[PDB]
Design a protein around this ligand. Structure first.
Ligand code: GTP
Ligand code: GTP
Ligand code: GDP
Ligand code: MG
Ligand code: MG
Lengths: 426, 49, 427, 35, 63, 440
């Protein structure tokens, strides 16, 4: 019907990938063996969107785990929800790219591309009618950023009707690991401004700042942020899986959000995040829930909307919940503010609602934001590409495999096309 | 910050101008009805006719 | 033999049709799985003792049809009638018009053919839809155009949810609403409309109900449709055939968009204390609150007014209260309509749904107004479209899926002609 | 009926939160063991 | 050491992690009514919004 | 078909109608559920309830009254009391924010959000009338809603309706024992907006009913529930001639032309003569003559005002029970020819007598007894000009040092409105003195 074939890339993907199928499978009542032990018959009617049925009534996900050091596949297979995949799908190389885009794009990665498309094209032909794909990855390294730009532009080559959606961790400079994160990130958008056209923006700096104020956590391990990431990639395709009082699938959210075809970088955020000490005293109604979607600290991308102006807003709700409190509450926020929300878009809110909440909650929601303040995240990573590239600090690590000095400049103003296009609409 | 404070004071003055005009229009409409009814009554003139 | 064929298209269509067909099935003595432990206006009969509705359900997203196909009405319909696409229209007039609906328009028209050959005295179709979505604009436009050029001069009535001023869920809703109004301006006999924001206000105010869902609206729309079509099933003092609205309400062939309301919308805890006589309910129809479409009533003058009374009603009460309404000279009727009204009466009182909220009232009125007031809604629905189309927002998807840039413009002018036509027939 | 359902759901969530509290006390005692 | 009153601080650290509550939100509040009913929504600046109760002689728009 | 619209206002108006409407559900056979019981519902020969109660098609009776205040805690004891389902729920208007004992708060600030709303529920109740005999305002000269909003209703009812009777019942602030300090600012500022727009207004002190209870009813420490039974008996006796037929039937429209000699002297004071505790009713005969001689006493008034210092302009005696009218006319000749009871020398006729057949009833728990006949005197004596020489002095001391005026000028009122409504009672203190003078 409306299926999606999942794909991963790199270490930063598989930790979000293996946390994803710990969440989707627990929403469908599926054991790590794969056989169904649920409670409602409604949990299995649209299980064919992500999964596939083997013999014996066992279900296999439609996912391919891609990396370039075989220690990463041993990390995920040995995990709790990790033996579920068909073992003919862990496609990897052996000689690591090693935070080198030019390896993962030109020389090392392209040795493996003819293999990885076969497991892509066999799980997509098993489908009857495609809707799209998924890539979970980052934009800091070279094993997953540069293969990720390979693996999209050679998958638009084949299935360019069906709408593809990637989910990208964009690297902040305030909490950074490697030195050359400008050199991989500011040019990897050259094939993500064009080829996916559905891409989300998650910052590791803002993912910490959720975890100090709202959650108020002491020790945030990397297994709890991917909890927070995989519970909002799930929410944007719950209408596509579960029945809705007013629903909107994946393609419907594209045609109503993006005003012009190169502005598709989003601002996700989960609604009812609350701490374990202040959980009981907190009210759970709908005007309380819109108190928390439109914050500046419950936003997973490290850019502040009040330094910009909103283009459009979606908010996919969940639960058994009324419909005047959806609609009249979000007219209210649009009316009382009226300055961030633009003119010449006379309604700046889209909405939707399912019937089934996430497991263990009375009601939740998922906020999607499309803001014009995201151009300060592109400004603050290209200025750090002015500094290192004037005196040519690190270009020899990637140019032993062949890129002249202007292919970085060609994809500089191709990225700096995108800064000004938010400016002209503000 | 200082220019936004200037516009806040501007819109407060505009608000009090419209509030004064609401008061004057309410008094005018009530006094117009009061002076308009005073000869005769309503619909009993029709029944008597 | 006053048979009508009902097609529900759009999610608004099928979710209204759920409440409509539970209301019609409880109207007669039909138990809901089909059997029975006058009904030939909407139901065919098979000699095992089974009743089959004259209904075709269609959407291009399978889950909203499949919940009907699995739920408690699975044995009501011949299960080929629940038509279902593969890929959703994705809120896209071009996709539901030019690209996606070309796989399913043939199936729905052939099942319409088989039902109209099952029928024998055919009178009209009831097409249930909205002005919000791709399959609620484009597929309905193709359906109406093909049924007009195929069946002839038979009454294709359409029922429309209307886009409110400050209430919408989409962003691009002026675009597809002005497009479906342009291309369905010609081949629908009449188009009733309702406003969700006004039903929200009535649900807050008259019925004492806070936070209403969509079932609490679709029950009211079911009561409206049943009060329209009680005349064909049950006979009364002054019956009104369904063709009579075409020569009655609309004066010029672009003005076929009348409004409606239904006056004793009242909960049990207040209707236990209040009596509701005929003069009371027909005076109560004309409040600016108790209408069902948001237009300011007092800024417009009335053209015609078709009242439908249901239950115990004596005709002199009607004929006195009508002149009582007329003589006030603030309810401005146009100076080229001295007749004013058109009234019908049926004997069988309004019924009650299980799990319901409208109180059982002995008599009820549904009034069909034709006002001049809706020029403000057409002014604002042209204005929002004009605000977005100054700099080409959201257009490139629809132009990649099948219209050039000029067809939005010619629909803009072919809709603005209607707003000039109201000032023409107003002055 | 709706009131009974809502009270039952509230009791289920409070039981789950007590389970979370006991799990975190166990983990802190494990850290004290690691000291 | 018969009695012991030590200054505990576990709740103070537990609440003061991450900085105090400062409100960062878009402006949301409803201007409420004056008449107490579930119906009869009357504010100062949006008066005449009530249920016009049923009248035998004349409708509401011609008072 | 005759009718009254008993519109209340104020927190001392809802507590009067609680004890007023329980009397009218007992005069008729009406249950608190509203439906008539089984014995009277087959014949249906009685249509005496149409003055006050409506009648729906399903056989339920809903009274004609709207309850108004800005304090939401005395209406919310009606929506949970015994009379929960009698009143129509759209006729109990109730505001969130208070009035808080300021006239100017209850005329200009708060009351404008309810002046439109209550004038739609009034228009329902007065629309069923073939003929409206008259309204019945129950208010108080004490505080915000009962004194401020009442003046806002008077300037909007008469503009709406016009030459239609509107009787008024009102407490009057006591000489010595009152319960407020801002109170004389109100009672001078509510008479001035009632001198034009009220056809008649009765006068009652709660202090004089505190005196009759220690004296006649033989009750020590009376509560506020026992003040609203006495007032509730009078408003029965005024309106009983509409409902139950009589020998000398006297309607409401009869009074307002038959008590006022000059058109700003509409402040008559009233009394109820046979109030006897049920012990002493076993001891005392209660004839028709001796309960006429017991209205003109120096002790059975209801305003603290002894009319020995004044001349009686007129009386309007209304009788109820079993009376025969040879024996009424024997007693009125005694009171005219008695020397002390002063009559103004431009009224040689003097009186107005009314007769009705229904005996007064007994509410269960009421301290009053079942007495075979009862009267209700109505007079506007000259002596009431004494009582304004007490209240208008109490306005003058406070306004000399300008005490308490800063809440009023800040709550939407101009400072000049105390000056013009002070000079206005500098005429009415003289206007009684010109007509009490003997003829020249
Ligand atoms: N009365 C009623 N109206 C509804 C209901 N659900 C949605 N609507 C209205 O329908 C409008 C949107 O309908 P559409 O945009 O056509 O969505 P759709 O019917 O699914 O059409 P497609 O998305 O193309 O399949 C919204 O503005 C809602 O107000 C419902 O259950 N009852
Ligand atoms: N005779 C009588 N007097 C009462 C009764 N209840 C209160 N009072 C008196 O009436 C005054 C009460 O203040 P009110 O002005 O009536 O209260 P209000 O009308 O709601 O005005 P606000 O309290 O300011 O809102 C006081 O003087 C009380 O002595 C009653 O039941 N019977
Ligand atoms: N969500 C998540 N992000 C991680 C984790 N480990 C590293 N990262 C992010 O990954 C970025 C570095 O890119 P990298 O993971 O090396 O790309 P790779 O070459 O594909 O492994 C850093 O900025 C981290 O923020 C993890 O366990 N979970
Ligand atoms: Mg849809
Ligand atoms: Mg009070």
């Amino acid at each position: 019907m409306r299926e999606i074939v999942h794909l991963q890339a790199g270490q930063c993907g598989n930790q979000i990938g293996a946390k994803f199928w710990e969440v989707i499978s627990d929403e469908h009542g599926i054991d790590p063996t794969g056989t169904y032990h649920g409670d409602s018959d409604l949990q299995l009617e649209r299980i064919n969107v992500y999964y596939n049925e083997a013999t014996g009534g066992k279900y296999v996900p439609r996912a391919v785990l891609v990396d370039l050091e075989p220690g990463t596949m041993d990390s995920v297979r040995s995990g709790p929800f990790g033996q579920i995949f068909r073992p003919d799908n862990f496609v990897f190389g052996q000689s690591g790219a090693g935070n080198n885009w030019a390896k993962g794009h030109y020389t090392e990665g392209a040795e493996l591309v003819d293999s990885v498309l076969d497991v892509v094209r066999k799980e997509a032909e098993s489908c009857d009618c495609l809707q799209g794909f998924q890539l979970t990855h980052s934009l800091g390294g070279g094993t997953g950023s540069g293969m990720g730009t390979l693996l999209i532009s050679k998958i638009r080559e084949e299935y360019p009707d069906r709408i593809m959606n990637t989910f990208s961790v964009v690297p902040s400079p305030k909490v950074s690991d490697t030195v050359v994160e400008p050199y991989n990130a500011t040019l990897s958008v050259h094939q993500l401004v064009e080829n996916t056209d559905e891409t989300y923006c998650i910052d590791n700096e803002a993912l910490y700042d959720i975890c100090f104020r709202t959650l108020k956590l002491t020790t945030p391990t990397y297994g709890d942020l991917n909890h927070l990431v995989s519970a909002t990639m799930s929410g944007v395709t719950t209408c596509l899986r579960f029945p809705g009082q007013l629903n909107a699938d994946l393609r419907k959210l594209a045609v109503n959000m993006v005003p012009f075809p190169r502005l598709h970088f989003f601002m996700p955020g989960f609604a009812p995040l609350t701490s374990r000490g202040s959980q009981q005293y907190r009210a759970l109604t709908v005007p309380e829930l819109t108190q928390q979607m439109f914050d500046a600290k419950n936003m997973m991308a490290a850019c502040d909307p009040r330094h910009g102006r909103y283009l459009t807003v979606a908010a996919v709700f969940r639960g058994r919940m009324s419909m005047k409190e959806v609609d009249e509450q979000m007219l209210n926020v649009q009316n009382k503010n009226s300055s961030y929300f633009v003119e010449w878009i006379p309604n700046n809110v889209k909405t939707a609602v399912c019937d089934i909440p996430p497991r263990g909650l009375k009601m939740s929601a998922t906020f999607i934001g499309n803001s014009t303040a995201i151009q300060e995240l592109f400004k603050r990573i290209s200025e750090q590409f002015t500094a290192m590239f004037r005196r040519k600090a690190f270009l020899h690590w990637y140019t032993g495999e062949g890129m002249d000095e202007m292919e970085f400049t060609e994809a500089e103003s191709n990225m700096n096309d995108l800064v000004s296009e938010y400016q002209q609409y503000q | 910050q200082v220019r936004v404070q200037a516009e806040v004071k501007e819109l407060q003055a505009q608000n009090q101008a419209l509030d004064r005009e609401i008061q004057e229009w309410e008094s005018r409409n009530s006094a117009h009805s009061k002076n308009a009814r005073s000869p005769g009554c309503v619909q009993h003139d029709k029944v008597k006719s | 033999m006053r048979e009508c064929i009902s097609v529900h298209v759009g999610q608004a269509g099928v979710q209204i049709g759920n409440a409509c067909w539970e209301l019609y099935c409880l109207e007669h003595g039909i138990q809901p799985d089909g059997q029975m432990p006058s009904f030939n206006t909407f139901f065919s009969e098979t000699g095992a003792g089974k009743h089959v509705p004259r209904a075709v359900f269609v959407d291009l997203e399978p889950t909203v049809i499949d919940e009907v196909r699995t739920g408690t009405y699975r044995q009501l319909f011949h299960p080929e009638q629940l038509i279902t696409g593969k890929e959703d229209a994705a809120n896209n007039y071009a996709r539901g018009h030019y690209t996606i609906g070309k796989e399913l328009i043939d199936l729905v028209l052939d099942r319409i053919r088989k039902l109209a050959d099952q029928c024998t005295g055919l009178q009209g179709f009831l097409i249930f839809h909205s002005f919000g979505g791709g399959t609620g604009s484009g597929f309905t436009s193709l359906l109406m155009e093909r049924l007009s050029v195929d069946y002839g001069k038979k009454s294709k009535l359409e029922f429309s949810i209307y886009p409110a001023p400050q209430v919408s869920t989409a962003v691009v809703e002026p675009y597809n609403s002005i497009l479906t109004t342009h291309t369905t301006l010609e081949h629908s006999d009449c188009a009733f409309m309702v406003d969700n924001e006004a039903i929200y206000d009535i649900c807050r105010r008259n019925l004492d109900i806070e936070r209403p869902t969509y079932t609490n609206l679709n029950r009211l729309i079911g009561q409206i449709v049943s009060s329209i079509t009680a005349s064909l099933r049950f006979d009364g003092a002054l019956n009104v055939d369904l063709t009579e609205f075409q020569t009655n309400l609309v004066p010029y062939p672009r003005i076929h968009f009348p409004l409606a309301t239904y006056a004793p919308v009242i909960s049990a805890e207040k209707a236990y204390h209040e009596q509701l006589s005929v003069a009371e309910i027909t005076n109560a129809c004309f409040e600016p609150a108790n209408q069902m479409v948001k237009c300011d009533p007092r800024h417009g003058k009335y053209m015609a007014c078709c009242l439908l009374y249901r239950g115990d009603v004596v005709p002199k009460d009607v004929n006195a209260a009508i002149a009582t309404i007329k003589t006030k000279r603030t309810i401005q009727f146009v100076d080229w309509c001295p007749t004013g009204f058109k009234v019908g009466i049926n004997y069988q009182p309004p019924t009650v749904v299980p799990g319901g909220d409208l109180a059982k009232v002995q008599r009820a009125v549904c009034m069909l107004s034709n006002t001049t007031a809706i020029a403000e809604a057409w002014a604002r629905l042209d204005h929002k479209f004009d605000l977005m189309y100054a700099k080409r927002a959201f257009v490139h998807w629809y132009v990649g899926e099948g219209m050039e840039e000029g067809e939005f413009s010619e629909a803009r002018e072919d809709m603005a002609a209607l707003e000039k036509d109201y000032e023409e027939v107003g002055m | 009926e709706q009131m009974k359902r809502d009270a039952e759901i509230a009791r289920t969530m409070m039981e789950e939160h007590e389970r979370l509290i006991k799990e975190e006390s166990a983990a802190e005692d494990k850290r004290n063991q690691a000291k | 050491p018969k009695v012991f009153y030590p200054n505990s601080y576990k709740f103070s650290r537990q609440v003061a992690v991450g900085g105090m509550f400062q409100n960062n939100t878009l402006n949301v509040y409803m201007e409420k009514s004056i008449v107490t009913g579930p119906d009869n929504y009357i504010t100062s600046y949006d008066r005449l919004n009530f249920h016009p109760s049923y009248r035998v002689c004349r409708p509401s728009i011609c008072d």
